[PDB]
Structure formats: structure tokens, C-alpha cells
Design a protein around this nucleic acid. Sequence first.
RNA 1: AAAGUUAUCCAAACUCGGUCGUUUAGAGGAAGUAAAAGUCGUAACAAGGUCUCCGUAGGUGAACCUGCGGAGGGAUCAUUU
RNA 2: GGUAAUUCCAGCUCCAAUAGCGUAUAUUAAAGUUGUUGAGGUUAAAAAGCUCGUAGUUGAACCUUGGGCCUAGCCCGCCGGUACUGGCUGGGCUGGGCCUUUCCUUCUGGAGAACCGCAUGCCGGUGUGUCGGGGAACCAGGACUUUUACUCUGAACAAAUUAGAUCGCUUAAAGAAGGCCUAUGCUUGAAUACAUUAGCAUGGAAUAAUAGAAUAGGACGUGUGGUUCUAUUUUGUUGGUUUCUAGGACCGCCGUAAUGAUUAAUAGGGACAGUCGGGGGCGUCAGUAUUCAAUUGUCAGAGGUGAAAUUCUUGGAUUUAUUGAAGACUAACAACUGCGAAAGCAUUCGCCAAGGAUGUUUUCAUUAAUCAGGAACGAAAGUUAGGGGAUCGAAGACGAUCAGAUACCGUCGUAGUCUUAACCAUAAACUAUGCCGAUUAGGGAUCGGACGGCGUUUAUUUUUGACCCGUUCGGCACCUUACGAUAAAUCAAAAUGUUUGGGCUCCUGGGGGAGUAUGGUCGCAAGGCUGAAACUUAAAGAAAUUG
RNA 3: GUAUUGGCCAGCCGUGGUGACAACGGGUAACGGAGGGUUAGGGCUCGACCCCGGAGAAGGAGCCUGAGAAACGGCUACUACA
RNA 4: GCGGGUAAACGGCGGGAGUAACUAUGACUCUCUUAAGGUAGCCAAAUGCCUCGUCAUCUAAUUAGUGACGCGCAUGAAUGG
RNA 5: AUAAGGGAAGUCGGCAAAAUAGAUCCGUAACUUCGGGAAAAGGAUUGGCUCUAAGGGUUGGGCACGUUGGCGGCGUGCGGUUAACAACCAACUUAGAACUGGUACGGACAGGGGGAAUCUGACUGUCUAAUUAAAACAUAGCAUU
Lengths: 129, 142, 150
Amino acid sequence: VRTSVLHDALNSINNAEKMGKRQVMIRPSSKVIVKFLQVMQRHGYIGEFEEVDNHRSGKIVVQLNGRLNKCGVISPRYNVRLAELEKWVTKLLPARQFGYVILTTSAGIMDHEEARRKHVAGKIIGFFY
Amino acid sequence: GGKPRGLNAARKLRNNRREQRWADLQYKKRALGTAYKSSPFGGSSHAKGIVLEKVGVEAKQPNSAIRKCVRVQLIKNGKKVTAFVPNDGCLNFVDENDEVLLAGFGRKGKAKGDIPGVRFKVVKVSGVGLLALWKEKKEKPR
Amino acid sequence: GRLHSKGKGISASAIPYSRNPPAWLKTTPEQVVEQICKLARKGATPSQIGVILRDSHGIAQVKVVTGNKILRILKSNGLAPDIPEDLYFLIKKAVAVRKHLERNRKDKDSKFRLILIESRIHRLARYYKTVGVLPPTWKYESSTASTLVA
RNA sequence: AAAGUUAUCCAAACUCGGUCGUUUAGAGGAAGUAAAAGUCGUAACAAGGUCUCCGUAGGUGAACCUGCGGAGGGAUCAUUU
RNA sequence: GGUAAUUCCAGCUCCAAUAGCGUAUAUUAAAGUUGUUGAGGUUAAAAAGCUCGUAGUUGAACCUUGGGCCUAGCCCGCCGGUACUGGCUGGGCUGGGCCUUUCCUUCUGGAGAACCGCAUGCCGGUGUGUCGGGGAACCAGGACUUUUACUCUGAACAAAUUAGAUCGCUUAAAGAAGGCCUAUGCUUGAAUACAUUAGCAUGGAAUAAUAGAAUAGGACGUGUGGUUCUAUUUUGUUGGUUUCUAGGACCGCCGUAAUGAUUAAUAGGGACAGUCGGGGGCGUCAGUAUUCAAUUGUCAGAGGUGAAAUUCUUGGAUUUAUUGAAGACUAACAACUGCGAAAGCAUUCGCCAAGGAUGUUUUCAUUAAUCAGGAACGAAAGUUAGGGGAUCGAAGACGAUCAGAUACCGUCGUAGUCUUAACCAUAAACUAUGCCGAUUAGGGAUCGGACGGCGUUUAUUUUUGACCCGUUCGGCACCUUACGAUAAAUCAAAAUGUUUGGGCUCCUGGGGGAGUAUGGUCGCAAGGCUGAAACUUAAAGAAAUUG
RNA sequence: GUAUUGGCCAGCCGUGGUGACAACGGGUAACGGAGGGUUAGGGCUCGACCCCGGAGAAGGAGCCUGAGAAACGGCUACUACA
RNA sequence: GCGGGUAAACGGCGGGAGUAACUAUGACUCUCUUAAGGUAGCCAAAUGCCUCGUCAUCUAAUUAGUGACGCGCAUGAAUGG
RNA sequence: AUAAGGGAAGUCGGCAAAAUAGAUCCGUAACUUCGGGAAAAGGAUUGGCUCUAAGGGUUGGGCACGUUGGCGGCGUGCGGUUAACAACCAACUUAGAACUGGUACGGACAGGGGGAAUCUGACUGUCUAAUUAAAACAUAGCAUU
């Protein structure tokens, strides 16, 4: 049965980019995905996203702007120290000058390069470049 | 593919590794400690023994020769094995009752080359060392 | 896709996007309760009462007009059954097959089939006890299961 | 106040039995591996000249045969009112 | 290496390291050949025969966001001047204050600033003073707050060792020394960070769990009775007593309030309606065929093989017709068609219980997925007692072929092949492909249900049945193609994997020895389940290409 | 009773305690730790041995003196050596 | 009398030559003979003359006892193993 | 009937004799037709006197506000369940403790020796009265006419 709606949504997006379409549907809505979309949106990796509504889980629809590569997710919620972040950015990122790992902290769901500025840490959820 | 991946599932990963570790051949020989119990050498590198007789061993198919082996009985345990003289015309340097010293062939248990089934070789005789006699840098004690 | 089978089905029922009673019904909630109670007194069960109330006259969905569910209404009027409907109906199947087995001793498939019913019954009963609907000593002895039915 | 002596306690050590663990002696029996030139047939690889293989059961100097039920990893992806 | 040796034994020459080089054993990297990061499981080693289910692992969505003002600290861009200095209402990042239904608990005590009025004084202001009134920053003291996981910052925790700063032991490994002038002298260092799990404090409140009002046994009141207990200091002193008073426990009446229950998941269960199927059990009906028997009619070889031969015959073989008995089995219709968890399941009717899909503005509300041990079923052959024993047919006897033939070919024939009551639990039990969930390409056929439509067909007809066109849900399959995969054969999954993490269980680690020995356990036995080592070997193996 | 607490011991009375989150038992060519060897990261392996802690003086037991010993370059007895 | 059937009916279940890379033996072959030529098992056994057979164990010493070996004068399958 | 020291050296052969023996409490192997072997093997206690504890039966409660009857029996109506009392009656069986003795105590009688194996018959049973009780006979099971 469905066990990670965040992974399901990200998987649908990746298919479209490698096949070249411009639109994807997402069946389950949640705060975590919707905030996750915003982190990319503030960097331009995605376009405008529309949220429909019904008294249910709720669908989402965004149209893909291209210029997007692999965006994955780490299913077992690990625990990250503030010192053991260079290990993760070395682990899964094409290069140092760009790309983003996304964490969850008590200060909200956010990413690195600002967690370093805010001196915060938490758990890992995904990445996108 | 097919591993357990949950967060509170370290026990299963530990259990599978310890169990599946036994199918490995190199590791399993260490854990059970067969070499100490079974090998003619009790985990050591060299040993000393006394010579019983001189024997000739036939090579395998493609080659053809007489390999000039020797019969030895170890002092530690008293077991009897066969040892390959490793040079040219040394069977005139070893006589009966000469208390030789033995080493291995460096294949860690198996036989090397064509010789059918001998795992040791003579390094010393009367405490002089073979190569010394060959290059006539010394003489045997009288 | 399905608990005790090898097939999947999606023959569900879609609930409309309208939390307001249709204007043409023009029926008050106060009168609604009595007929529901009427059928319960004659001997019906909450599941089947709804289909007559829906089919025969008016209300398609009780919740919008009333604000509460049929079981919630009945419980506040002290007509709720002791044992929940789902648990009750399963037992009715288990008893009948038992009677069949004692005459037909060579019906191997039903013996396999019988295993399924109580396994479902046992699994469902565990949930009821931990939430507080059933007393923590109810056990469903296979011998006296007939007494529980009636 | 010494030798001695009465009754408990802590107990080395010895005898006999029971159980567990380690090493090892043996008339005789049944095997496997290597070194092949031997001796008797030709089971398998082609429709290997009886298509091959699996489970079970009996038989036969030896590879092997036959009965029952399967499989194609076959020598057939195929035959019409 | 088998008579001109690139490889042996020697001379010359050359190569590598160098005061050192070789050999044996153990251990690490090489090893993504132990794989959490990160490894195979269609054919190369490997998915349990199938299903149920406990430990254990994992589990759908949903409850305070946004906007409007003020301010600080830091970086970059710009101008200009002398590394230094100022400016942009510059652009940002971090933080702190108020308002929007949100502000942020409370009591006692301490000292005291800013804002205020007085006058001795000076140039709209201030020290003045034991002048006095507010609410707020700090400190001390007391009471109250869902609980764990997580992360930040603190405290405490040997020396040696690790990383690392300084000093020319003549350099270095080391050492903690040293440095300056001329000096009866001066001066320095012997630093710093980490360990990381458990325990003690502090800030954070996303993420993952957990409790709260439903037969109200719910919250508040300086509203108001009551019944129980504890008892400060004040009435000279003590003892006993009482009123008032201060506090605590229990329980009524009245008042206050928007009086307390999330959606109904292309999660799951159950109910309801019309259908659907060679799903299962018990009884029952029918069908030819085979063998035997009875009646009936004739006249010579008949059966069998590549070809012979056994065997049977005027006590009439073989063939013909009618009738009867026995046991097994339901041809043709029958198919890239159905049902079941698999093994498997095909004649009629009656009875008994069960199931999927479909339809649905019914119902409960997270009740779910996979499972170590554990359990039910489990072809054929085989075992123990009866019944039955037509046909085929292990063992076996005869006839042929053959050099032999314990076989392949022929005539018989025992156990068995059937059934009742109990055992056994293995198969190439094969899709050689575990189960649940999401996404991804075009097509036409086909089975079941539902929906829409112009027509046809024949019906005490009309609705309906049946044929045609189309849409949709759920299955057994197929054709073209690769954007993808693999070593390839090929694959709509064997794809979405060096750009590697949806969830859970099982199995394998070069080939033999070996599914053997020993131990345990189940079985009347045959056997099943679990399951090694010594020793030996440089290849065994998969897919495809040319002969 | 000991310097003191305690099923440490003596009497009377209850029936309990641990376990698949692996108890109990068996093997270790096992003293523990600070640490050594080899490296992208994650690890694998060794640690009798100069520092800290524990135990022993052939094997077992028993004791005097003293603040401190079940001491062995202290004593008593048995075992095995001599 | 001639011809078939019958052994859980009475009973029976043999000799002789060649041979495998020291030797030795003989899986295999050729030969005489009748109805067939002792299969699975067991043994100096209450059944073996030669015999106090040969090997191991028990005792200081064992013609006795037990476990093996088997061309067994003359073991052996309802005369049941 | 008894005998020091030795304990089968006697003899064809442990023939005859000796040793163990009751009851209570512990402990008990190989093998197996799972019923047995099993009293396996092997250990400890046992008197007298003075005490303690446990194991039962019968009869009343049982009340009140009236009733018929010679303080009492019935025919009433109700209540109430003594954290169960009081009186009387009667034998034996089991368990615990102290003291005591020339360490003895089933004090006479009564009263199993045991273990490791081989041959042979499955077992209970029967026969040569007056020399042979066995491996002989019979038996259930199996098979044939």
C-alpha cells in the first residue's frame, strides 16, 4: 500500500522530464510536498503549480518548465549533524557550485546553504538538481 | 535487492551478515581454526624433521621427468610427509639421518607446478642451508 | 488490493461535492429520527434501514440533513446493539459451514475455506477490544459460538 | 597461667558411583580421490541410430531396462465445413 | 626441454633496488568476490509446491499560515577623499519589537534609571533633595506546565599517542628548549582542536509516535449552602473552652458557553440488487464402447510382424443378429476459451453451503502489507486392512531379432491400475520469473458486468431475447516499436539503477568430495526435515559466430 | 555476625524470579582499557608487552602481628616433586 | 499307454579349460553335462571329519567363552531363512 | 549349629551352606512390539517417655406484631443470611518437637542376592503314576485341499 506520498510525487515528475512533457498530475496532497515544491520554485527549477480541491486528499497539477534533472528522496529518515553535511553534499550532487539537499528542522522544512547560515540541523528528506 | 530498510531494523541487518558470512571460504577457515588442528605444521611456518628414505615422483601429462622427492618425519608431532628438494643435483648433498628443515611452497596448502601431491621443500640440512653447498661457499660438518 | 483473494476491484460509491441538502426536499431534521427508530423497533439493522429511507422517500445521505450518523443517533437513543454489525454477520457464516462439515466429512476445500472466516473474525475482534467497544475477556469459543448468535 | 581434654565451625585430602568435555588403540567391513597403457561392452553428444530429462517402484555383470504420472531445456510457435 | 633451447647448465653483455635483497607464514588495500553507503536470484551458483497466521519490521490525508509598520548587526555594488574616512532613502542575509480574534503565567521583597512638577545656579534644560506618584528592565523567594524520540549551545572528563603553532640539536628522525648586550643581568614558551555511545543542564517545536469532554463521572464562579479535618497571634502566665478567622478534602442549587464527536482515501471490512462460472460435497439420471455369457447361421485356417513364430480351431475358429452381466470413462462440440490458493476440475437433475467482478448519494471508520518458529491442503508411485477386480499392465513365463539381448517387436499375465477407513508429503510441483503499491506506447481481437444508439429478427409478440456500432470497469492472451534494459537470447517488464534508498520475507558465493558421514527429529517401512569436515583441482559454466 | 548495608547467616511465613528484544549451557590457540597496522568516505584486523585497573607466586585450604595481609624473598597440614 | 497342468505335493538345486601394463586372482570367452545348477541371508553355530582351524579380546598361564574370516566332508528359504 | 587369617586356590560343574529381605523418604541406565524393563542398580531412617497440630456428628439461633390448642405445636403474613456462634457426643490415622540409653531399636517369628552376554522356545498351559518336565506337545497367526 501507499507508504511515501512524497516519493510517489517526485517519481511522477522525473518521468516527464526524461520523456519531455510539460505537465504532471499528483494525486495525494500534503504539506511536505507543497512546501517541497516551493523550495525549487524559489530557485526556478519548476513553474507554476495549481492546487485543486475536494473534500478528500486532494490532487495537484503543475506544468513542467524543463531545465530540471534528477530529483530523488531518501526513504529512511536519517539523523544529520551540523558537521556531517560536507559528507552528504559530497555523496549525492553532480558538483559543488549548484544543487540542493533539503532537510527538515525545528525551524521548518528548508535546505542547506542557509541551514549553514542559520546554524541549524535536523533530518534529510531529498535532493534536486 | 531485498534488504530491510526501516529505521528500527538494525537487528536484522546484523543477524543476516553474521549468518551469511559463513559461506565465504577464506573467512570460514579462520573462524573454525582448522589449520591449527589439522595441518602438519601447527600454524607455524617452518619445522624440523628426520629423513627416512629418498623417493622419485613422476610428473603429470605434458611434462616428463623424475622430481626427486624425500621422506621426512617431524619432531613436533611425529607425522610423516614428503618434501621436494628444490635444486639441481642436491640428492648427493642429503644422506640418511641428517635432520633437515622444511618450509612450504607458498601456495598455502595446495601443490605447485606439476608434482602430484607434495606441499613442502627442504631449506636446510645439518644446519648449513642448501644454496651454500650449491655455490660452494661452505662445507658440511664432519 | 483485497484481503483474502487474488483479485482487485474498485466498485466503490462516489460521494457528491455538496454539503447542503437539495432545496426541493424541504424536510426538517426533527421528523427524520422517528422513522429510523421505527424500523429498528420492528427488527431491522442500521445498514439496511438506510437503503429503504434512501429509496422510499427523500433523504439520500442522512449526515447532511441531520448532522450525525445513523449509529450515533441510535446510541444516544439507547437502541445500539451490543455487538457491532460487522462482527455479528461474520459469525453467521461460520456457524452454517460447521453444520455442513459434520455431515460432509470429505469437503476438504471448505475446511480450507473455513480457516479464513475465523481468521478474519479473530483479527477484527482484536481491534474492537483495544479501542473499548468489547470487554477485554471476550474470546469467541468455537464451541459456544451458537449462543452468541442467539 | 603451659600440657591435656569436651561440643560446634571452616575444611585440605582420599575411596566409590553418575554425567559432560577433550585426545587416542583396534582383528575386520564399506568408501572416495589421484596416477593411467591394461580388460569388457557403447549409455550420452546428429531423429547418437529406442527423442532426452524428473519423481517413484522392481529387475539386471556393468554402463543400463521396464511400468505410472510429469516437463521441453524437442525433432512441432502453423491446417481451413 | 624430444640434436641449431628467447625459459635448463655456463661466459660476455644488459635490467631493477642499493648497504641491503631474496624465501615461508599471518593480516589489510586490491574485493562493488560480504556490499547500510554498495553487490546477484528467466537461461551462468540461487524465489520455499501453495495458502493461513503469532513474535519482529513498516504503515493515507487533516488543527496558525499570511499581511501592515519600526529597529540593530554583517557582506556586496557605487562616489569621493587621505591601509584609513564619510555617503547612497542602494541591494541583500541574520535578529529583535508592536497591529491584525494571536502578546507570552502568577505572588512577595530588594535597589533604582527615563518621563513628570519645586528652588537654591548658570548658560529649555540639569547635580540639587534622605521631596514624592506611576508601570516596567534585573536579582532573590514561592506556586502552576501532556510524555518520550530529534537537533543547537553549555558544563565535567589522565598522561603518553593523532592532527597541529614556535625554536637551525651543523640538517633529519627526535627534543621542549631557548633568546639579547659586555655585563655581578634582563626576557619568553612549554599553545590549540577532535574523540561521542551512556549520564547533567539550555534554546529550538518541523518531522515520527502517545492522552484528553459521548450513558458528561466535563471547565469556570471571590454567587451560595453544607459536612469533615487541620490551627498562627492577639487578649498578664499556665492548663482546658469558645466566637470570629486562615487553609484542606468530599458533595448539592444557581449562573457562565457558539457547551464537547474531522474528512469518508481510485485504504480496508461488512450489508444490499441482478447476474456469472467444466469451483466443492452428497444423492440421483443417461450414454455408446470393451470383456464375458445365452440364443441364432455357416465353413477353413485365424492372430501377429519389416518378415517369420507362440496361441486358438468341424466339441465350429473368425465373422453375423437379439438379449443379459461386470467395471472404468463422459469422444465428436473442445478453442492462443472458463473456474480454483495450488495439486486440479467436462453427462442430467435435486439438495447443501461458498466465491470474484459489476451496480450503489447504504453502513463501521485505519481496523492495513509481508512474515523467522507454527499450521491446513498437497499429482504419480508406495504402505496397512476390507470390498471390487471389465480393460490395460511393474515382477515373471514363453515367441522372434541379434555373436550375445536379462531390451526395443508378439501371446499371456501377478502386484497395481477402481473404491471404503487410515499413512506417506516428494515432482522439469516450470511462467525455471515471490507479495503489496505508483508512473511510463500504439493497436486490434476475446470473457463477465454496466451504459448510450439508428436498425434488423421473429416471439399471446410490443418490453425483452438475439445481431450491429460505441464508451467504461475487471481478467486469460497477442501484434509492431524501443524513449529504456541486458553479455546476449530477448523483455510493456526482465523499464523508471554509477544521476545508485516505496515496504516486507526467503535463497546463493569457483568445480568436485556431497545432499555423503555423524547428531537430532517425524514415520509400521520405503524414507522426509536439518546438515559438515579431511582431501583434490585451473578451470567447470552461459549466450552468440565461422567450419 | 561484620568496620557498616544486604537472603551474608539462624528461625517462622508467602510462591515466586529469568526467557525468541535469544535466558541457561557450550567453544575461545580470551586479562580489560588508553591504543597499533592498512585507507576517498563507510570499514577489516590486532592488542602477553614501558600508562591505568584486576588476579597469581607449584596446587588447595587455614592463620598470628598490625591502621593496612587470607602476605608466600611469613607460619601450619595434605598432594606432586626434591 | 500317448498328451497337457501341478513344488506353502514328496523332493533337488554340477564339472572342465583360457586372461587384465610386477605377480596373484579372474569381471569376460570357450567347453562337457540333465529338469535346474544354492539367489537374499547365516556359520568351526545344538549342523565342520582334518580341528585344540587362523586373527583379535578376556587370564600370570585357557582343548573353555565372545567378535571376525569362509571352495560350507555334509548351512539355506512354510521339509521355512 | 559355631569357627582365627585367606575367600572357590576344592570340584566335571559355587552341588550344600552363608549373605539380601518389612515399612517410610530419595535415586534409577542400555534396549523396546512405547504397554514394559523396575522391587533395576544404589542410599538414609526405625526403641522408650512427655507434649503439640490436623482430619467429624447431633441440637438450637430463627426475630418480631396476632392466631387454634394444653412455657408449647400447626395454618399464617413479613424479614435475614451472625467478616459464623453456643452446648453435648465419638474412634482411629497422619505430621512436628524436646528429653533419654553401654549407637541399641522390622531386637523373637516373618522375610527378593545382583550385574554384562551367547544358544534355544514367542508368551500362560500339558505329558512318560514307580529313574528322563525338556529345546518335546499344544496354542493364537499363516497357507493348501
